[PDB]
Design a protein around this ligand. Structure first.
Ligand SMILES: [Cl-]
Ligand SMILES: [Cl-]
Ligand SMILES: [Zn+2]
Ligand SMILES: [Zn+2]
Ligand SMILES: [Zn+2]
Ligand SMILES: [Zn+2]
Ligand SMILES: [Zn+2]
Ligand SMILES: [Zn+2]
Ligand SMILES: [Zn+2]
Ligand SMILES: [Zn+2]
Ligand SMILES: [Zn+2]
Ligand SMILES: [Zn+2]
Ligand SMILES: [Zn+2]
Lengths: 88, 90
């Protein structure tokens, strides 16, 4: 989703980008927490803390990728990127 | 799937109860927007931003997990089996 009228050079600069940072026993542990007879808060706090590490890595990847995408855009395309960002 | 499990009247009430007993952060998004729309990627400020709502995320996730555990446990074994099998597929 990118209604920015992007140039051929741009699309392929973008592929280059979504390849460095285009580069699950988590959901198993949460499954075990939900499906247990009893709710173990301390065990759930530790799962949340471990999820924080992957969220960190994922958010850093997303944001770095998006920052590089932004900084190949024209002033006009940047304004449009920013407006689009306010709505999704 | 996920939410269509042939809940009985009683289960419908019991879920109603649970969900009162455990009930969009724009300021967070604004700060993501400042990091993305800058002429450089500032990792140290990005890490600060990401970490900022840790405690609120903890409370919300703990509430969510306790709520889901409580609803799992009012299910019959056939419904638990359905829910678990769907869970593996997500
Ligand atoms: Cl799982
Ligand atoms: Cl924003
Ligand atoms: Zn599972
Ligand atoms: Zn324990
Ligand atoms: Zn990098
Ligand atoms: Zn009825
Ligand atoms: Zn506010
Ligand atoms: Zn914004
Ligand atoms: Zn700002
Ligand atoms: Zn500068
Ligand atoms: Zn912390
Ligand atoms: Zn804490
Ligand atoms: Zn409680």
């Amino acid at each position: 989703f990118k209604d920015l009228n992007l140039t051929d050079a741009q699309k392929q600069q973008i592929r280059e980008i979504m390849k460095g940072q285009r580069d699950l026993e988590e959901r198993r542990a949460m499954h075990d927490i939900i499906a247990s007879d009893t709710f173990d808060k301390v065990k759930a706090e530790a799962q949340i803390a471990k999820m924080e590490e992957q969220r960190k890595a994922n958010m850093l990847a997303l944001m770095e990728t998006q920052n590089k995408i932004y900084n190949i855009l024209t002033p006009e395309q940047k304004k449009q990127f920013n407006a689009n960002f306010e709505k999704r």
